[PDB]
Each structure stands twice: as C-alpha cells, then as structure tokens.
Amino acid sequence: GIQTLWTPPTSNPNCTVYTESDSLLSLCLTKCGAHVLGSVSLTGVAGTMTNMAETSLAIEFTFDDTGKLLHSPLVNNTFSIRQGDSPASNPTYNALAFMPNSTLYARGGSGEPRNNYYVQTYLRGNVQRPITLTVTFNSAATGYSLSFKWTAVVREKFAAPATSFCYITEQ
Amino acid sequence: IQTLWTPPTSNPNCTVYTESDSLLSLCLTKCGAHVLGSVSLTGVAGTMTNMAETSLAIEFTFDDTGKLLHSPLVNNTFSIRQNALAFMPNSTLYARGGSGEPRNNYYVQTYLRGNVQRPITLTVTFNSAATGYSLSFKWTAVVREKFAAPATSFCYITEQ
Amino acid sequence: SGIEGRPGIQTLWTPPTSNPNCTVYTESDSLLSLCLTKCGAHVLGSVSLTGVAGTMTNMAETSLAIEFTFDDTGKLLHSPLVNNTFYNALAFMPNSTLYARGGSGEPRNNYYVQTYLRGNVQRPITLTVTFNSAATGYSLSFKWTAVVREKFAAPATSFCYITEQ
Ligand SMILES: CC(=O)N[C@H]1[C@H]([C@H](O)[C@H](O)CO)O[C@@](O[C@H](CO)[C@@H](O)[C@@H]2O[C@@](O)(C(=O)O)C[C@H](O)[C@H]2NC(C)=O)(C(=O)O)C[C@@H]1O
Numbered sequence: 001g002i003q004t005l006w007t008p009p010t011s012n013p014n015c016t017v018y019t020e021s022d023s024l025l026s027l028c029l030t031k032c033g034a035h036v037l038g039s040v041s042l043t044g045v046a047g048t049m050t051n052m053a054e055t056s057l058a059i060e061f062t063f064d065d066t067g068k069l070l071h072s073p074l075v076n077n078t079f080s081i082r083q084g085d086s087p088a089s090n091p092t093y094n095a096l097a098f099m100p101n102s103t104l105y106a107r108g109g110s111g112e113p114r115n116n117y118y119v120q121t122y123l124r125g126n127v128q129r130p131i132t133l134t135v136t137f138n139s140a141a142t143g144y145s146l147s148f149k150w151t152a153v154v155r156e157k158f159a160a161p162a163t164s165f166c167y168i169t170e171q
Numbered sequence: 172i173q174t175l176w177t178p179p180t181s182n183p184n185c186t187v188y189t190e191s192d193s194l195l196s197l198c199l200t201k202c203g204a205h206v207l208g209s210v211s212l213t214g215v216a217g218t219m220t221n222m223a224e225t226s227l228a229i230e231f232t233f234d235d236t237g238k239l240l241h242s243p244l245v246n247n248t249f250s251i252r253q254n255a256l257a258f259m260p261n262s263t264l265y266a267r268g269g270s271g272e273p274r275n276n277y278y279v280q281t282y283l284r285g286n287v288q289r290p291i292t293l294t295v296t297f298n299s300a301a302t303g304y305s306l307s308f309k310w311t312a313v314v315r316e317k318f319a320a321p322a323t324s325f326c327y328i329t330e331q
Numbered sequence: 332s333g334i335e336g337r338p339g340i341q342t343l344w345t346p347p348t349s350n351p352n353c354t355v356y357t358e359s360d361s362l363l364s365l366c367l368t369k370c371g372a373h374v375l376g377s378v379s380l381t382g383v384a385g386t387m388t389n390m391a392e393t394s395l396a397i398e399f400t401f402d403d404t405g406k407l408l409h410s411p412l413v414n415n416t417f418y419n420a421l422a423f424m425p426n427s428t429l430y431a432r433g434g435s436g437e438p439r440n441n442y443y444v445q446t447y448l449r450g451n452v453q454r455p456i457t458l459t460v461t462f463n464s465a466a467t468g469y470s471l472s473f474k475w476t477a478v479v480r481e482k483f484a485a486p487a488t489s490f491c492y493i494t495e496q
C-alpha cells in the first residue's frame with residue numbers, strides 16, 4: 001500500500017529557505033518499479049522569498065544509509081508516508097526503495113552529469129522568465145540525498161511552478 | 172484500475188475547431204499519490220492544418236465526484252482502460268480557479284511538428300475550473316501553419 | 332545480461348554499473364543507463380549516457396544515436412549494449428496503433444527532452460526519443476545533439492509512452 005513519500009498538500013507555508021515558514025514547498029515521491037516519480041514546486045510567501053537577494057536558491061533533503069530522513073527545509077521535517085495508505089498504526093516501509101541508486105548516482109557525485117536532472121520552467125509562470133531547476137541525486141558524501149537548485153531573479157518574488165523528475169532507486 | 176485514457180487510435184478522435192479535425196492522445200496512469208500523464212495532439216483537417224490563431228487550448232472538466240463533464244473528444248471515449256477522485260488533481264495544492272497560480276501550472280518544452288525551428292511551450296493547468304476539477308492544455312501555435320504537438324508528459328499530485 | 336527484467340515483470344533495465352557497458356563508436360566506450368517501468372498503460376523511462384573513451388570523449392559529429400530494436404513478440408533483436416542480451420514483453424513495447432511502425436516522421440512518435448551537455452548550461456542539447464521507427468516489430472531510438480571537439484555526456488532524463496499491451 002505504501003507507494004508514496006511526501007509532504008502533505010497544504011495552503012499554508014511549510015518550508016524555511018531563509019526565515020521560518022517563508023515558503024510553501026510541495027515534494028512528492030511515488031514508486032513505480034525501479035523508478036521514483038517525483039514532483040516538486042516551491043512558492044515564496046514571506047521575506048526574502050518575495051524580494052530575492054540572490055540569483056539562485058537551493059534546498060536539500062538528506063537521508064542516512066537506511067533511508068531515514070536526517071535534514072530537510074520543512075518546518076518540523078514533515079516528510080513521510082501518505083496517511084491512509086496503510087490501515088496499520090506506525091506503518092513500516094523500505095525507505096531504500098525510495099532512495100536514489102548509489103551505483104548509478106555515486107555519493108559525492110554532484111559533479112557527474114548522470115547524477116543531475118535538468119528541468120526548464122518559468123519564474124512565477126512568466127514566460128519571459130525562463131529558469132532552470134537542477135535536481136541532483138546523492139550529492140551528499142554519505143547516506144542519500146535529493147538536492148534542488150532553481151535559478152531566480154533578484155529583486156522579485158520567487159515561485160517555481162509544478163515540475164517533475166524521475167530517478168532509479170536503490171532497492 | 173490504474174489507467175484513464177482515450178484509447179490509442181490512428182484516425183481523428185477530437186474536435187478543436189470542426190468535427191474530428193484532430194487526433195488527441197491523453198492517458199493518465201496512477202502511481203500512488205501521482206498521476207503520470209501523457210498527451211499529444213495532431214492536426215488532421217481544416218484549420219488545424221492552417222492555423223488561424225497563435226495558441227490552441229483544450230480542457231477536460233470534471234464534477235466534484237470526478238465524473239467527466241466536458242472534453243473536446245468527438246465521442247465519449249475518455250474511459251477506464253479495458254474511485255475517480257484518485258485521478259483528480261489535488262484541490263488543496265492546486266486550488267480551484269487557480270490558473271493564475273504558478274503551482275497550478277506545469278510547463279513543457281517541445282517542437283511544433285517536431286520542427287527544430289519551431290520551439291513551443293505546452294502549459295498544463297490543474298484545476299483552472301472554479302468548481303469540480305479540471306485538466307487544461309494550451310500550446311503555442313504558428314498561424315498559417317499546421318498544428319501538431321509531439322509526445323509529451325506531465326505529473327501531478329492527486330486528490331485521493 | 333545487458334537488459335534484465337525484474338518483478339510479474341515491472342522493470343526492464345540496464346543493471347546499475349560503475350563501468351562502461353555500451354558501444355556507440357568503439358567497444359565499451361560509454362556508460363548507458365536505461366530503465367523502463369510499467370505503470371498501467373504507460374512505460375516510464377529514464378535514460379542517461381556518459382562517454383568514457385574514444386570518440387565519445389572528443390566528438391566528431393553534432394549528434395549521436397542509438398536504438399533498441401525488438402521483434403513483433405517484443406523480443407530484443409539488437410541494442411548498443413556490450414552484453415547484447417536479455418513476463419509479457421508486449422506490455423513494455425510502444426503502442427503500434429498510436430506510434431505507427433516506420434513513423435519516425437510523425438510528430439506524435441517523437442518525445443523531445445531539453446538538457447545540457449555534461450550538465451553545462453552553456454551547452455544546451457536536445458534528446459529525441461522516437462517510438463517504433465522500425466518498419467517491423469518495435470523500437471526505441473535515442474538521438475542526442477552534441478558538440479564537436481568536446482566530450483559527450485547526457486545527464487539524467489526521462490520520458491513516457493503508451494504501451495502495446
Ligand atoms: C554536473 C556538472 O557539474 N557538470 C560540469 C562538468 C562536469 O563536472 C565534468 O564534465 C565531469 O567530468 O564540468 C564542466 O566543466 C569542465 C571541467 O570542470 C570544463 O570547464 C572543462 O574543464 C577542463 O579542465 C577539462 O576538460 O577538465 C578543460 C575543458 O576544456 C573544459 N571544457 C569545456 C569545453 O569548457 C563541463 O563542461 O564539462 C562544467 C559542467 O557544469
């Protein structure tokens with residue numbers, strides 16, 4: 001039943017890029033065989049996220065060698081199984097079935113082209129503002145990781161539209 | 172049930188400007204909280220072969236139970252492949268009436284007719300409709316040229 | 332083997348490798364990752380290709396193409412894999428009604444991906460994935476643009492097609 005790891009859809013800020021609860025992140029990973037299908041978007045809500053000082057923005061989810069979450073930008077690290085996918089309390093799952101394959105995407109391999117997945121989108125959906133999202137698999141030297149870097153425009157609000165990506169899993 | 176689609180076909184099944192003027196492929200497959208969608212649209216007759224406008228938009232609208240209300244298909248062929256809300260775009264993340272919100276939009280780069288001199292954008296929008304659910308597609312087009320949009324795909328989080 | 336199927340069968344893939352497994356111009360000159368997973372009527376595909384040796388590290392042409400060709404039962408006939416060897420195979424084949432055989436000239440038989448050579452944004456390239464270019468049986472073709480006198484590597488990408496069964 002457990003095919004999904006996500007942060008729950010919400011209309012309230014749930015993410016901290018520069019200051020607490022300054023943004024609304026969606027991240028969802030669903031398993032289809034040896035693939036994870038991932039979706040992500042990030043909307044600035046407050047502070048610097050509404051008036052950027054830098055030309056790029058990056059966040060990262062890191063996991064240990066068992067697939068257990070170590071760090072994320074989410075307020076209260078609300079990244080877990082989707083509720084209702086198991087009738088049991090405290091549902092167990094194989095977290096490695098959602099981790100990026102460590103043979104194809106070597107740890108510490110952010111400089112390797114095959115560890116990176118590139119997405120073209122538009123800042124705030126404005127078609128005069130093309131930006132790139134770079135998703136990197138296993139940048140971290142130990143454990144597993146998913147890293148997201150978007151290009152951005154200074155002195156404007158940041159928001160990245162709905163996007164998606166796909167990687168091969170460890171198990 | 173894992174798949175909602177219009178069945179593969181090689182003859183026109185879709186009405187953009189006039190009856191059966193185009194061939195639409197649309198297929199939605201459920202994987203956990205995601206739908207993986209594929210779409211393409213090939214002009215076959217009439218204005219679809221000699222465009223009058225510089226964009227083309229079609230929409231699938233559903234009621235609040237996930238039942239199809241309208242689409243550009245010639246016949247009622249959008250169907251389960253031989254819980255509707257499990258295929259609908261999430262209405263918390265993609266707010267109804269939210270076509271103007273960036274997170275309700277998914278952008279795809281492709282090429283008109285597969286022509287490298289004709290880069291175009293497909294915008295897929297989730298829940299543009301004020302009520303119920305919707306999937307909307309809008310492609311750039313070139314006037315006085317044929318319209319065809321190659322194979323593309325997209326992904327969204329579901330309601331249930 | 333070169334392509335292996337995993338559980339009934341939901342995944343066809345090149346097994347993960349640290350070493351070259353593919354022959355574009357010369358034997359074992361590249362590392363290919365190709366993975367096809369069945370999700371209802373879709374295959375979700377991922378692909379990347381890293382040059383390791385020879386012309387792959389110093390390109391002579393502005394594009395590179397490889398193809399996986401299958402017979403009408405879905406059996407693998409040929410691929411660029413070093414280990415050129417390999418369940419309802421038709422469940423993984425591109426749909427021959429929508430993607431007609433010999434139809435590489437039909438826009439709907441082609442899926443375009445924008446990416447960056449060696450992950451360098453000053454080097455935009457396109458991947459064209461084509462379904463059923465073969466006049467008989469089934470096929471998946473991959474063509475990337477490239478830059479002469481530079482090393483070839485195409486980053487992680489993905490694509491999706493409707494299946495025959
Ligand atoms: C994902 C990523 O970070 N990609 C970068 C790649 C990549 O790290 C390497 O290709 C992996 O081996 O490197 C890019 O820069 C390279 C080297 O880092 C170039 O600047 C080349 O540097 C040289 O020193 C080299 O060949 O090593 C000289 C060479 O002439 C340079 N290449 C050119 C043609 O600019 C890369 O483009 O490969 C940057 C990329 O973002």
Ligand SMILES: CC(=O)N[C@H]1[C@H]([C@H](O)[C@H](O)CO)O[C@@](O)(C(=O)O)C[C@@H]1O
Nearest residue numbers: 123124125126127159270271272273276
């Ligand atoms: C999807 C969409 O329509 N995007 C539009 C956005 C958003 O509607 C607002 O940012 C919502 O707050 O508004 C713009 O003025 C912008 O910010 O550049 C133009 C852009 O085309």
